[PDB]
Amino acid sequence: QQSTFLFHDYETFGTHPALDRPAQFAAIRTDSEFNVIGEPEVFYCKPADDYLPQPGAVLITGITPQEARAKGENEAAFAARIHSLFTVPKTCILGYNNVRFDDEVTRNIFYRNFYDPYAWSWQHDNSRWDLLDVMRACYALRPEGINWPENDDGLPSFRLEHLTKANGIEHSDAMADVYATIAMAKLVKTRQPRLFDYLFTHRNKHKLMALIDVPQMKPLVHVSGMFGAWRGNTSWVAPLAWHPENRNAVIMVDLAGDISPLLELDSDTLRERLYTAKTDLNAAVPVKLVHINKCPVLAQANTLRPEDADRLGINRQHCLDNLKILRENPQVREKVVAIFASDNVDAQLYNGFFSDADRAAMKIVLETEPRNLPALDITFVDKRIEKLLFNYRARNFPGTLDYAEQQRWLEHRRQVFTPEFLQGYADELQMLVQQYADDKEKVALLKALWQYADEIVE
């Protein structure tokens, strides 16, 4: 059995990985050096009839709901195909911004269609990775040898099209984003192999865990989009405490920040001071969760060299200052712990995990042909599952609904498709037409979206 990377990307009908629906999935499999070792996997998901797409997304993706309905398969089958691809042993599943987006879509698709929302990402030596944090780390820590493009504002751009172009790489098609992601992996691996291999090694949570010494507050380099392009997404952090609820979250302090509010203020204050940000100027609370299960970029503090800090405008001396004050102040530790100490089922993935029995029973749901779902005797403990099961049957297999179920589906469709909603949606499209009068392909997409609301709703 051989190690493979599976590059993949979704187009969806909206920004919400749970309330919005998938439109297209695209993937290619690769060997460990990024040679293509399979055929392009590209396919559509038919949206169910209880859903209208976000106009803005269709304008981006160029994919009407009409095209996805005509060329696609119901979400059950869509889930199936992805599931196979993802569950081939020794696969590293990766993409571009996939951790904060595509993986959330994947989990919701699996959750809605009775697959384990997680197992695919760690079973049989599967893992996940996200090449966006790699590009960011590369820029932050070891930029030399690659061209780093700046947007109109003057800050670094990690949009795939700028990156490829800045580096003489043809960027043309569902497959285009995927090929660009591969080309970027190649580039970083060639120009900067030791960093690339280090990050790859540290996608794993136990290797990350090894970096974290809380009693001693070992400072680390951290590269996160939360830190902002204006410091190349980088700071020195120190771990203060483990999250008291999330077993995979550790509470870090941002050492370049202002640690005065940590010492001076109490826990209640800090809780909403951290929550309601950028309204009070009242220094920011320099504190962020790092989730060892979300491929965070972490490295021993001295991999960010003095000269590297100068490059990014990071004040090395201020950081070392804040660390020394912290260490000699362990009442901040119990303080930060204290800070952390919807009726729609589609949005309830994160209401807990399903027990062994719960999850074995959803397994039978899967094994059962749609036609025999009504005739099914099994019990459920977790209260979500009935809800998922009705929605799963109505959305994918409307033919199998009995009289009282067809009625229930209707009331559900009427519930979403209110006079308020439909008039808004119609008016949205009509304004977008005006806004984009100059952009003819959009006018046409917008109009097509109108044709679709016409048929599916009234």
Partner: peptide, 4 residues
């Protein structure tokens, strides 16, 4: 000692 450094990794990269």
């Amino acid at each position: 000692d450094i990794p990269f």
